[PDB]
Amino acid sequence: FRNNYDGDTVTFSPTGRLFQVEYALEAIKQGSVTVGLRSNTHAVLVALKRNADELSSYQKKIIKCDEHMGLSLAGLAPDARVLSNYLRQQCNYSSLVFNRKLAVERAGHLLCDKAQKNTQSYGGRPYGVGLLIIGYDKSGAHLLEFQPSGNVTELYGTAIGARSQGAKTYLERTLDTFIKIDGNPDELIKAGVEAISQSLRDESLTVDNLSIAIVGKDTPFTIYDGEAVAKYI
Amino acid sequence: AGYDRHITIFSPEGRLYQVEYAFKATNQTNINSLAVRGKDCTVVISQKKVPDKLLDPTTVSYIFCISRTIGMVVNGPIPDARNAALRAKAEAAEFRYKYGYDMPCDVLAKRMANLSQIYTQRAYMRPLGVILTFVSVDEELGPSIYKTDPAGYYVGYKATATGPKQQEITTNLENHFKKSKIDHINEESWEKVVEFAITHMIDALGTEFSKNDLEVGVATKDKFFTLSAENIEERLVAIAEQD
Amino acid sequence: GTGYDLSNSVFSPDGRNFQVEYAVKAVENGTTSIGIKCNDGVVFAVEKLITSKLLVPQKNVKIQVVDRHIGCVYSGLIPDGRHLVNRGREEAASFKKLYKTPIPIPAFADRLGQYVQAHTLYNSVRPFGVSTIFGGVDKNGAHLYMLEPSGSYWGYKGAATGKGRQSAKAELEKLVDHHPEGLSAREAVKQAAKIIYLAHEDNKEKDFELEISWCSLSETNGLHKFVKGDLLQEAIDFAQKEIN
Amino acid sequence: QFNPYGDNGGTILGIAGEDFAVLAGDTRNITDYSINSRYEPKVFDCGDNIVMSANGFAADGDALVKRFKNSVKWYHFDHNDKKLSINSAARNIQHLLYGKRFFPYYVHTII
Amino acid sequence: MTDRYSFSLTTFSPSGKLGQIDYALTAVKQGVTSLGIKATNGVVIATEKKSSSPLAMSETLSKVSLLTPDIGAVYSGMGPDYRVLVDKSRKVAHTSYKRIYGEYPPTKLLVSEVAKIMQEATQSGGVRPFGVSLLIAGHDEFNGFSLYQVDPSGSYFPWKATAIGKGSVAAKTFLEKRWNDELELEDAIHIALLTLKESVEGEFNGDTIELAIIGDENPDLLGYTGIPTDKGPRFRKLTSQEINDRLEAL
Amino acid sequence: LKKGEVSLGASIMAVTFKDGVILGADSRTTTGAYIANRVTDKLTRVHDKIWCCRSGSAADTQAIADIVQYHLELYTSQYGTPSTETAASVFKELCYENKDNLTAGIIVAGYDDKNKGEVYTIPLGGSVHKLPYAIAGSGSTFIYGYCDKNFRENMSKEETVDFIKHSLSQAIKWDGSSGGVIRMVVLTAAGVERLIFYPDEYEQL
Amino acid sequence: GYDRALSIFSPDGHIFQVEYALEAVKRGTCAVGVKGKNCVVLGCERRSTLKLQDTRITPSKVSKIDSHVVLSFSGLNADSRILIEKARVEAQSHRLTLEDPVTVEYLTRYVAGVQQRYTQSGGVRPFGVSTLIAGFDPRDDEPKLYQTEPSGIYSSWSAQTIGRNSKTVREFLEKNYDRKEPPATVEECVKLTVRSLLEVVQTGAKNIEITVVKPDSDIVALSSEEINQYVTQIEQEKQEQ
Amino acid sequence: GSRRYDSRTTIFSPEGRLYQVEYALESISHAGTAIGIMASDGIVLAAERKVTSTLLEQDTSTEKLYKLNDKIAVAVAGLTADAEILINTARIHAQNYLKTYNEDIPVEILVRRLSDIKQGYTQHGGLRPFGVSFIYAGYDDRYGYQLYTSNPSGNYTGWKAISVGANTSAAQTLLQMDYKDDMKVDDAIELALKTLSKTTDSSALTYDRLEFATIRKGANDGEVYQKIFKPQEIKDILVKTGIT
Amino acid sequence: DRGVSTFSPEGRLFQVEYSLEAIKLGSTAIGIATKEGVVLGVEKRATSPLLESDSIEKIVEIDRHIGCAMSGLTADARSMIEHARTAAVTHNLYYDEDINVESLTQSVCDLALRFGEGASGEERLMSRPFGVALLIAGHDADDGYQLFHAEPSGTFYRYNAKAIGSGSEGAQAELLNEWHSSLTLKEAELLVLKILKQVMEEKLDENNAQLSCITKQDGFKIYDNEKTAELIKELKEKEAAE
């Protein structure tokens, strides 16, 4: 059955499935949770960072791609580095050549196409990381969810990673409320933390644990780590 | 070792199964065609079957105008058929640019057959599952029919048929030529050859045809063209008088 | 023996390319999308599934334009479709660059066809997991086409693909039988919306979003434009009307 | 024959104080005997408390400044938002300039 | 995409056998019979035209091909493979010899060049061997007349007479009895016709047989007069009628 | 223009009229003051009803026309009959993209049923200009005045043949690099007509 | 074009191709090297599967990489040639650019580096060779001896052996070589080496070849007879008891 | 993918042996025996022909003994065609060296280079090895008469007398028996022939089944003469020695 | 067979996980980070007594301010060290400053997943992942003393103390309990020595273990045998108390 149809991404199963891609989607599921949500003025990324032992640092989950866009990752970190680098370059080219800030919708489109190439050719392997992209462009605030299959979706809020489904429900409930947190960055963040705290189980989010990022109207993409997330627990 | 049936390498019996399986694919469309040569023309008839009522009938064809002079009828899946048509059109144009004269039907066939031979020898390339019947009225050879297949074989014919019911058509034509003793239909107008063709296809397949059930290509000196539904009907209406 | 379905370009004993056939299965598991050819244009419509309330309404556009006169919609693996459209765009540009005139629809179709077929020729590539409905207006009329994973394509009067393909084709056959004169783009837009709503029953467990676009010589100037605003709501209403 | 270079005039001046530094430059841009602009900024804030001017052939000047500002952007990316110090900015610019040693940027730059 | 088959498809099996070469030789065994006989003043190569239908025009398919004006080839095996080997042989005759030395190559060397093409199909990446064995007959100033056989492995050997294909064992036997070193070309054509008659199942005549010789220079086939050093091609395909005339003197 | 290569000199023009378009040209080629060929055909067919008048380098224009003829034959096989605008574009692409090594001033004229007759002039740089009529070649300088004074849109065949005939005779009169016979190619719905006028006729007009 | 990963990790963390390369070494003739106070001696056994050889020409088992460094090996003879040639080129390239010949550690690190590259590059298999590289650094007098293996791992040894039965003779050296009084003479260094080989070769004069390398490019291969004189004197410090 | 069809010709077996090389050596053991014997005044190369007949042209033949230089020749055991590929590269290397140094190429240099090519097919590239073993007989000013041998692995060694192909163990035993360091060529000829006669798998050793060559430095000259025996000469030398 | 960059049904790259297993068979290496320096110690583990132990290089200088220890298939690290050194020097050339330790680390980790057979994305030629882990320790002005553990998976973590190699599960457990924000360089050296002493098969002496440290003032220095013997002695005594 399987070892016949899951050895390469270039092989479709009898039911039309791409197993290597589906296995990639699984690495994401074993990654730490990260939430994204936005109002009409700001977009926030909140991420629970994970460690290896109690003697190590907590691996970063948020990456700035340009002053108006960034993302949180879940899954294989080396891959997020590879894809955020591409996004950094694509953002840079737009500015350099057209003196234009790359639109989030376009960033999403670009990410999808980069991921797809890795699912139709032999020898390759799908990317094994998921990303939540938030940004503030000419059409306002945006949150996008990217999955290694190449599917990128624009949302109001979301979460990915292990137990992501909890926060995904909180957001799905709190929608009417957070979509209106305009002009109040701290509140949006608090909604994001509330959301992320619904996918906890192991411990409580501490100062070495949480990572938040916000971007919006008069706020360049900025990463708050440790010291500065104290006021949100 | 057992993968000798997946790529083009010899089986212990010296057979190339992928080539053989390519020959079975040519029959997947359930369309038959035949070609006959006149005194100064060459006609190819091919069945036209449009199942889905949602299709635009004007786009369903397995007959291609390769060059101003060469026409080609394909028996095989449309995507492989079109892959071949495109290459043939490119080969024909390039030949004219490089050599200063129009590429002969027989030379185009040899070229397309040589390309096919390659897919037979190189493991990365799969054979195309199609049979190509090239027709024209050559400036040196006269009316011509050259047919190439997945094994890279090609030869010229007095007339020929291709498709699931190839044998019935072939035996019919064979009988006509043993009876008349010549290598061509002895009619002056391509219209009568077209009629001869349709008649023999009907006699052979035991089936009656309407105008939307046939597809016809004719090759005459300096041009190859396809008949319209209405031109075919005029052929049909002319045949319903001998029978 | 067996194993004829593990590598793309391999011919089975009965002449089939199994990998292409499994690709079709990925297309059948996809959303329904259609195309309706009219008296002077084409209308494309597609069903967009609302995985949740978190999706921003009207933003995840699925229908795509090629050049300025071709519309493309597909069912199956969305990314593969985007890949095919990116190639379509490169090919349309190449054509315009060398010949000045925008690419004729029959020419464009074959361009897509040869590329897709190319992906059934080697074991180092996987076939496209999408069926694409596309077309637009050119020098001599409107044209609608549907392209399968095998690279096979033909012209259509109406076309449907995806999970609800059968209801759609059913409804599509009704339109072609009752209106042989042709259909106005306005009616086709309405009818497309209908057909998608009806087709939507083949996936009645999730709420949906309708997307329509058209290219018409009289309503859009032979250019592709999405159906937005008044026009779109009128078609949605007409749809929720003829359902009961 | 096509001459890839031009001379847009201008004069710039940088003076280092004890706890400050100034970089000034006139604002006129010229071509032979004509004035192209009476106000075309030639001194720029590159971020990180570094000002720069690449005076001479303006196209080359615009290009170098564009490249350096970008170098600063990537320095932050590649080195956890670390501040690019003036001595580092300097060595970096030497590399940008010498990169085109055989088709020079016809500019005299000062940061 | 891309030919990622950069590995050999023919490899040694535990018994020291080169599988694909043995299988190609089997393909050659199921092919129509072809033979060649070398006389004192000529060589004859012959084969049967196994037309796969009566609607086909057998003349448009030449199994006996001219490689150079003094060298001809015939085969047994897969026809398309032979056709491409002929193109390549005619070309190499020019690229590796005429364009360098201003003269056509001697038989053995042209033979050696075809053989190399076949050997490489036996080791290069991603290809299967050629399923044909060829009999190449030719003449050249310093070596006189010669007949060579080239196998799918690329091995070639010179023969006085030989036969390849379907009934090659029986035919090689008929040839061993009839052959002697005092035969004039007409006698070899004769023995060739006899040997072939036994391998041929049905109708045996000038339209179902293909014979060619490498003999005296044929000035009437040169196409021009005036230059005395080039006296004409030694290769000549016998016409349908020339064969019949000889069949009646059986 | 390369040292010593054959030059077309020429007096060529293409004029659109009611029924379609007519191309005209002289027939002289030169290598210095020697007339290498006194009866050349500068009216070249790139498609059934799309022709061009060649001027500049003989080699360059032949090479280019040979390639356009090929591109149009392949276009035709795949997409049907090409427009004159498309033929002009293919010509332009080659002339523009290789401007450093070619000396070709080409006038493309063609007939279509939807568009009637069309004229496109592709001068030395590779730019394309669609005009009612166009003149080129070294002999053209001399008839700028005459042509601008006498051309009228929608003339008849008879009138157009006359206009082209008078213009080129003047061009041939003054330009040493122009001479021979006056060839014309008439392109209309009816077909393609080839005309030729000898010295004895045009010289005294 | 051929780039298939031939050396890859298997479930337990082993790279078979490299491990199998070692097995090829285990089948090659034994090579031993032991160092004195002012010399290094390399001993090798002669493949006795077939005999009727022309000793004059046959590729010697010990090879000069430069005037002052030699390499011996155990494994695939053909593979050794590739390593040896690369080493000799790098030796001349070092003289040309640094104006001083290679140290023995440098040459070793180079050969070992090549060996490793063949363990994680596409389309190639590892070298089925282990080497003993010995000599003296320029203008220095301390003897050097290193050993490299298919994995590309390398290190220095007071004495070491590789090849078939090396486990056995390694045991002989482990309890007969004392770093307090390393063979203080060419003569006693050679004796110890032969002794070790005698514990494996099985009474054979011509069966052992010894190469002695001293400081300042003085490298000599003892003759069949010079060695026999040793085996004899050795069968005495065994028969008198 | 394509990995599926790769036989992996350059891998080690669990015992550290090269599969393809071991299998190529097996093929070689079925080829006619080739023997080389080195004397004080010349070298002898004798070989038994495989796949013969009454009709084969022995006069115009050469399938086992080939001239690489006027001073170097090889005897081949294995696939003739693979051998010709290598032989030609050796012929070119010999001429490259002559051009570069204006001196004939020393025998071992030619031998080493050829072996290195064989070795390459052994460690990289993914192609099957050459199924050939060579016996090289040659002369040069540094070492005089030499005889070497190389096999699919690319290992080469030197000998006073050696054989390759079928029945090597038997032939080597006989050679090691009657061979004496001070042999004369006339004596070597006899031994080579005697040895083949006792190891042949066929009835009797007849001229038509042999190829014979000697490289002698005829004292009444100076240049080394390579003589490839002609059929009648092999018949003649076969009588004098006593095999009839 | 099955590809080299294939994912497992759990979402783990096969070759990387197996790589991690080869690392569990290597000598132990331990690094401890204090506020006066970072100590790196390694178990030499000679395969026989005739081996001259000083030629076992498992602790290497990357730059004056960065050093590293290795564990696993040590030959695999040679190309990694070459890269790290070139990256640091190159950074100095381009920027006239010392490369940050994180940056040096990240640069090394970028090599990690650059393996495969034509893996559509970029050009990564290396038939397999690395089979060695590294402990990179150093000092830079912005983040002071740092110790990093770089794995073949490309991920690297910063650690206050870390053990890798065969005795890692045990050793890491000891480190977890003995490390505190106020250790001294001398205390660190002692711990490394103690813990190495515990997990090693052989009895730890100055010839089968190696210590090193990196300080802001003196940079990366590999402790010569004499300095370590004294420290080992100082250990025998401190342990023999209670």
Ligand SMILES: [Mg+2]
């Ligand atoms: Mg193939």
Ligand SMILES: [Mg+2]
């Ligand atoms: Mg394939």
Ligand SMILES: [Mg+2]
């Ligand atoms: Mg369908």
Ligand SMILES: [Mg+2]
């Ligand atoms: Mg700095």
Ligand SMILES: [Mg+2]
């Ligand atoms: Mg004049």
